[PDB]
Design a protein around this ligand. Structure first.
Ligand code: PC1
Ligand code: NDP
Ligand code: EHZ
Ligand code: ZN
Lengths: 209, 342, 145, 96, 146, 87, 129, 115
């Protein structure tokens, strides 16, 4: 290895994950839209939103998958998509010492199915996704805010929510309690335009319009 | 306007209101509310204090960083007044005391200190002075308090002819010494009242109304040289008012007719206390007196404010005086007291 | 004196020499108590009892559309025709020509820098005029860092 | 050098001092205005000019890696001095 | 580089004349009430307006509407255009019909009584661009300006 | 008092609905201007605009008739009526 | 296309009541949908490829204490990015923001010829190189 | 696709039914909120505030938006009933500290540049 700076590529795991992705796509054609393996050997399964419970249950229970652990459940906001919200399931298989990522999509008004019946861990993750992104989860045992203040309006992790929000809190001596007011900043956050006008990575170049 | 005095922002804590106010008497009941209202809109507030600086700490969160400045001052020293007044464009006089001390009588705090503040403010060139006298101020009053208030009104208008005199009635609020004063009579058995209080009529005003009226008088260009009466919306016989106070506090109400002379003896006995007398002869005289009617004076409604009734804000004052039995009762379980009108 | 906004302090429509309307956007707000100009005029109209029928920039722009519809076609150059009508109307005025030679207001570069109120208040324009009229040693500045 | 304003306020090295009508001077009352009395412009003005015998001189600010990025200064103009754009030290060719 | 002037000699507050005849700062309400009092006392030709060289169309139409409210039609500009014949009626009478992009397509340009170099520097740059690449022929009536 | 201050003629260069007003301007506008030298007749063409005649009277009062699919004779009648009362 | 109990809905998506945005910052704001201009200081074109949504800039004043730039505009720094103009206008419409969108300005193709610099009879010949 | 899937309600009448149930629950809860939180307001004031909060969204026609509004309203009701909210949270619907903002053109013109 005369390349001490470049991260070493492991092709055996890449092939193993490719074969398992083919396996998963073949077993569930009804829900699998796309499967891919990263250059750093991470396997993703893109599914229709209807297949959340079937795909997750298959990956948990199939003797060749045994993904018993829900490592993380989060959402990603991409405003330029009509289905702006990208729901990400990160699963771990202790039996095969492997990890898998399952992603689907939704918009502001379509409910995602709650996966608490598949993983008990999903209870707080789905509450957090609802809190920070506004994604509703149907059949959730207890869906409500988890991270934000009581009565907080909006979903802060949306890309169009301002960084400092809309209200501040302070103690008011007239009314003898903490009150909420529209946010004023003695020093407003200074927006930095950092992106270089030159293309960094040719291998990721999108074809011209 | 000086370029640093141009209003900016949206009227919030980080805004600039263009107001630089020295609030004499800012560490008191009325003072904490006008200071809060000034710091709400982003005003520069200068706080002269003679108390221990620990006693000014409740005013620190009232304004943005740098917008509340605390400075020592001496009421008997014109240099301190000049120091705390040099850079302000409005001066608010709120200093007063319901009792005389060994160093400050009623003439000192109601005549000499206001005249000194007015004269120093005129010399330093502050555009606006707001002076707080009493509604009942009278040169022939039975009260030294009100006689000195009248003398001080004269002196302030003489020294600062453009000053806005504001004359509130008995102000009520969370730390008012008016509703709490009557609610504190449960500690001495019943409620003694001269002539049972059936000859005294009061027109109390709410503290937030007074503070918003002071702010509006600051912002109103047509308040220079004007005198305002800040009265409440309703007038009450003192018996009816105290009965309503005790009903709201839920304490048993058993008044009795203590005569005037015995009540003055009682007040004289309380003056011996060297810490905040519970009552005095002067307070006994001013409680038994009726509020005057001054229809010729502009009021809180000539500054754009609707006067708040007592039957709306009395529970926020008297819920502290209720026992555990009646601590969690609604404000409407007590019907409003009978109002005497003009 | 009614303090108005400069062209960097308002969203404002300007039509160029070829006829296309273009709009600025505010980069900063007007200083002190200075206000947007159409808003000053609208406030004055309301105070005078002759309130103009627009309370908003979109409404004043629709008024602009009512008066001349090309004024809201931003970035578009609308063709204008009937040069022959103008030419046959122009032949009735039979005015004569002076013997005076045609001399432009700006003959050299020194006349270019200082033309309007903003560039007359510009010290950079003053430095440019000084450098043009006198020489290179006139305006001096240590560019040593 | 650090001077005084007509109001008596001390003028900083950036040339800042409130005017006589500025209310913001109330912040310094019963307090002090913090002014650094070592004006760097006057201090770098006191340093001599080095008579180096070359058309191009190099300056890194002194102390090697503890100075500033090393730069090269041209010394061909005989009226001006070549000065370092990092630390202000001036250089010139010997006696022209 | 003329943005330097945007920080100097700026009008920042309303001004009126004091009894000594000097301009003094005042509130917006006071100055506007003064103007409105003068506005609703004269009408027709007694109230007129002059528009400077840096004025937006919103302010122009607002002032025209306001002056029309008092039946005033004397809304003028500082820069004179011949009002005889068609005058302003036909838009083609008073604008660059070939457009700035159109001088590239031209075979020959005639310049009359103008110094486009300083009157309109970028239009003159386009003329030079077409002179250079398109071999545009240029003639001028006026001073032999460079 | 309410005399006519100005008229505005809005139209389009290509739209078939403004063709009658285009013909009117081509053949009749010059005579209209020779008969009304001091009347502002502001002809403003803009793409995809429905033809409209505006008449501004005294004190800012304006009224607009619509000239869509008008013949040149109809625009002549509409201007005659506007410029002579009847309207 | 799927068993989801397809319910008929109007094609005017309006999520303003669910965004939690105060009512002042919906009707009174005006967003700009544009492809940012190339910074004329550099000749790189990689920042002129996506569509931007920016809000109208409001008042910034000076902080009395430090002279900092203060604001009361929560949307002063909010900048959204989009792949096409249509996505930006759909996002602005469902959020209830009034918008003006300008067409993308791309460089026109240009005829570059090095041999023109040495023309025998044209003005394109250069006097220096 | 051409159509979309519902949250709960397949129609506008179902959405209205759930809105009415939520309004009922809030209207009955208001007196208990006033008593329990020791609010200095009246029950009429609190119920008028509940109505005014409901009336803000009266313009909504999408049954899914109505369903999500009902979901958030039930969430708020459960925060109020279980005393997860403090008195400060309940009192934030009443912007008692914020000054009355201007509404007409002239006052907004006087105080600044905001439309
Ligand atoms: C005879 C009755 C006199 C009542 C005087 C009074 O109200 O004193 C209150 C006060 C009590 O005020 P207090 O309740 O604020 O407590 C004061 C004590 N410290 C400050 C330590 C908390 O009375 C006294 O302190 C005693 C004063 C002398 C009492 C006898 C006077 C005879 C004449
Ligand atoms: N409260 C009412 O019902 C009515 C009040 N007023 C007037 O309203 C004003 C404010 O009243 P309120 O706030 O309730 O009064 P408080 O007694 O609660 O506060 C009085 C203020 O005056 C200061 N002060 C008093 N005496 C002196 C002195 N000798 N030297 C320096 N400072 C002094 C106090 O400072 P410190 O705390 O350090 O002593 C305090 O800041 C007074 O002018 C009062 O007379 C008028 C009518 C009715
Ligand atoms: C204690 C103090 C207070 C503390 C607590 C203060 C807040 C209490 C309430 C909190 C919740 C808030 O109201 C939001 C919700 O629930 S929103 C429900 C949907 N809302 C709609 O409006 C749907 C569409 N609307 C219509 O279809 C009709 O217009 C209408 C139904 C209104 C009337 O129908 P009718 O047949 O004319
Ligand atoms: Zn150096």
């Amino acid at each position: 290895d005369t390349r001490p700076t470049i991260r070493p590529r492991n092709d055996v795991v890449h092939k193993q994950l490719s074969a398992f992705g083919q396996y998963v796509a073949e077993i569930l054609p009804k829900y699998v839209q796309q499967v891919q393996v990263s250059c750093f050997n991470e396997l993703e399964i893109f599914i229709h939103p209807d297949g959340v419970i079937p795909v997750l249950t298959f990956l948990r229970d199939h003797t060749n998958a045994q993904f018993k652990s829900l490592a993380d459940l989060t959402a990603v906001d991409v405003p330029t998509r009509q289905n702006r919200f990208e729901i990400v399931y990160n699963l771990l298989s202790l039996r095969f010492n492997s990890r898998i990522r399952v992603k689907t999509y939704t918009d502001e008004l379509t409910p995602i199915e709650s996966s608490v019946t598949v993983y008990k861990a999903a209870n707080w993750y789905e509450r957090e996704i609802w809190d920070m992104f506004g994604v509703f989860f149907a059949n959730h045992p207890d869906l409500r805010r988890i991270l934000t203040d009581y009565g907080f309006e909006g979903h802060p992790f949306r890309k169009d929510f301002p960084l400092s929000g809309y209200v501040e809190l302070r103690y008011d001596d007239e009314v003898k309690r903490v009150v909420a007011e529209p946010v004023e900043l003695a020093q407003e956050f200074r927006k930095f335009d950092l992106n270089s006008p030159w293309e960094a990575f040719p291998a990721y170049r999108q074809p011209p319009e | 306007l000086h370029h640093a005095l141009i209003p900016h922002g949206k009227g919030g804590r980080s805004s600039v209101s263009g107001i630089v106010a020295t609030v004499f008497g800012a560490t008191g009941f009325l003072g904490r509310y006008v200071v809060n209202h000034l710091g709400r809109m982003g005003s520069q507030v200068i706080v002269p204090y003679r108390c221990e600086p620990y006693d000014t700490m409740h005013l620190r969160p009232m304004g943005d960083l740098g917008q509340i400045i605390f400075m020592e001052w001496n009421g008997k020293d014109k240099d301190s007044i000049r120091k705390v007044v040099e850079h302000s464009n409005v001066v608010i006089n709120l200093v007063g005391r319901e009792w005389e001390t060994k160093n400050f009588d009623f003439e000192d705090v109601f005549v000499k200190i206001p005249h000194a503040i007015a004269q120093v403010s005129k010399e330093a060139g502050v555009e606006k002075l707001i002076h707080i006298s009493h509604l009942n101020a009278d040169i022939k009053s039975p009260s030294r308090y009100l006689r000195s208030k009248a003398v001080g009104e004269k002196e302030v208008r003489a020294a600062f002819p453009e000053a806005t005199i504001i004359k509130p009635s008995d102000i009520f609020g969370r730390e008012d010494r008016f509703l709490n004063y009557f609610a504190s009579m449960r500690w001495f058995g019943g409620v003694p009242l001269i002539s049972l209080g059936k000859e005294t009529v009061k027109q109390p005003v709410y503290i937030v109304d007074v503070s918003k009226g002071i702010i509006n008088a600051i912002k109103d260009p047509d308040a220079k040289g004007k005198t305002f009466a800040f009265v409440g919306p309703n007038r009450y016989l003192l018996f009816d008012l105290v009965q309503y106070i005790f009903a709201v506090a839920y304490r048993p109400f058993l008044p009795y007719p203590l005569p005037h002379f015995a009540y003055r003896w009682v007040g004289r006995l309380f003056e011996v206390s060297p810490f905040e007398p519970w009552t005095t002869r002067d307070k006994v005289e001013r409680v038994h007196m009726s509020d005057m009617t001054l229809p010729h004076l502009p009021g809180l409604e000539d500054l754009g404010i609707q006067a708040t009734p007592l039957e709306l804000k009395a529970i926020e004052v008297l819920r502290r005086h209720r026992t555990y039995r009646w601590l969690t009762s609604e404000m409407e379980d007590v019907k409003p007291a009978k109002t005497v009108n003009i | 004196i009614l303090p108005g906004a400069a062209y960097t302090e308002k969203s404002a429509t300007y039509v160029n020499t070829e006829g296309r309307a273009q709009q600025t956007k505010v980069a900063v707000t007007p200083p002190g108590l200075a206000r947007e100009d159409w808003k000053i005029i609208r406030a004055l109209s309301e105070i005078a009892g002759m309130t103009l029928p627009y309370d908003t920039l979109d409404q004043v722009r629709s008024r602009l559309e009512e008066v001349s519809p090309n004024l809201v076609r931003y970035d578009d150059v609308e063709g204008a025709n009937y040069f022959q009508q103008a030419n046959e109307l122009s032949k009735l005025v039979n005015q004569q020509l002076l013997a005076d030679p045609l001399v432009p207001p700006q003959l050299t570069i020194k006349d270019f820098y200082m033309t309007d109120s903003i560039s007359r208040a510009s010290q950079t324009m003053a430095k440019c005029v000084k450098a043009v009229t006198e020489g290179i040693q006139a305006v001096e500045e240590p560019s040593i860092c | 050098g650090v001077r005084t304003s007509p109001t008596g306020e001390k003028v900083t090295h950036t040339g800042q001092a409130y005017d006589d009508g500025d209310y913001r001077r109330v912040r310094f009352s019963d307090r002090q205005k913090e002014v650094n009395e070592n004006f760097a412009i006057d201090l770098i003005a006191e340093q001599p000019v080095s008579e180096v015998g070359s058309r191009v001189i190099s300056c890194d600010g002194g102390g090697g890696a503890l100075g500033h990025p090393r730069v090269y200064i041209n010394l061909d103009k005989e009226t001006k001095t070549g000065t370092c754009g990092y630390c202000g030290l001036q250089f010139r060719q010997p006696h022209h | 580089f003329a943005y330097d002037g945007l920080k100097r000699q700026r009008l920042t507050q309303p001004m009126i004349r004091n009894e000594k005849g000097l301009l003094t700062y005042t509130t917006w309400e006071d100055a506007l009430s003064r103007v409105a009092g003068m506005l609703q006392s004269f009408q027709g030709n007694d109230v007129a307006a002059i528009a400077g060289g840096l004025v937006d169309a919103e302010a122009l139409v607002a002032l025209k509407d306001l002056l029309n409210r008092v039946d005033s039609d004397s809304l003028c500009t500082e820069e004179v255009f011949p009002t005889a014949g068609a005058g302003t009626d036909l838009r083609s009478n008073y604008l660059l019909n070939t457009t700035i992009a159109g001088v590239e397509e031209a075979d020959v340009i005639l310049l009359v009584g103008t110094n486009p170099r300083f009157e309109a520097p970028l239009f003159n740059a386009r003329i030079r661009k077409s002179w250079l690449h398109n071999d545009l022929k240029v003639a001028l009536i006026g001073s032999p300006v460079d | 008092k309410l005399g006519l201050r100005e008229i505005r003629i809005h139209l389009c260069q290509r739209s078939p609905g403004s063709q009658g007003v285009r013909d009117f301007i081509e053949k009749r506008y010059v005579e209209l201007k020779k008969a009304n030298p001091d009347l502002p007749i502001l002809i403003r063409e803009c793409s995809d605009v429905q033809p409209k005649l505006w008449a501004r009277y005294a004190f800012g009062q304006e009224k607009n008739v619509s000239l869509n699919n008008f013949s040149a004779d109809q625009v002549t009648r509409t201007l005659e009526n506007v410029l002579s009362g009847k309207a | 296309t799927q068993d989801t109990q397809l319910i008929a809905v109007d094609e005017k998506l309006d999520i303003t009541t669910l965004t939690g945005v105060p009512e002042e910052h919906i009707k009174t704001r005006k967003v700009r949908i544009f492809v940012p201009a190339r910074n004329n200081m550099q000749s790189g074109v990689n920042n002129t490829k996506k569509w931007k949504m920016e809000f109208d800039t409001r008042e910034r004043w000076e902080n009395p204490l430090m002279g900092w730039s203060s604001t009361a505009d929560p949307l002063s720094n909010l900048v959204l990015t989009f792949s096409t103009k249509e996505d930006a206008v759909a996002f602005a419409e469902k959020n209830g923001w009034s918008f003006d969108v300008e067409e993308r300005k791309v460089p026109k193709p240009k005829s570059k010829s090095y041999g023109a610099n040495f023309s025998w009879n044209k003005r394109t010949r250069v006097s220096t190189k | 696709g051409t159509s979309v899937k519902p949250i709960f309600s397949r129609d506008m009448n179902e959405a209205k039914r759930r809105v009415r149930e939520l309004y009922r629950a809030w209207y009955r809860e208001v007196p208990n909120t006033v008593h329990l939180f020791q609010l200095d307001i009246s029950v009429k004031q609190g119920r008028d505030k509940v109505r005014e909060m409901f009336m803000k969204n009266a313009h909504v026609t999408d049954p899914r938006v109505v369903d999500l509004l009902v979901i958030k309203g039930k969430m708020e009701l459960e925060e109020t009933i279980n005393v997860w909210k403090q008195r400060t949270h309940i009192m934030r619907f009443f912007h008692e500290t914020e000054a009355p903002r201007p509404t007409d053109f002239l006052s907004k013109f006087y105080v600044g540049h905001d439309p």
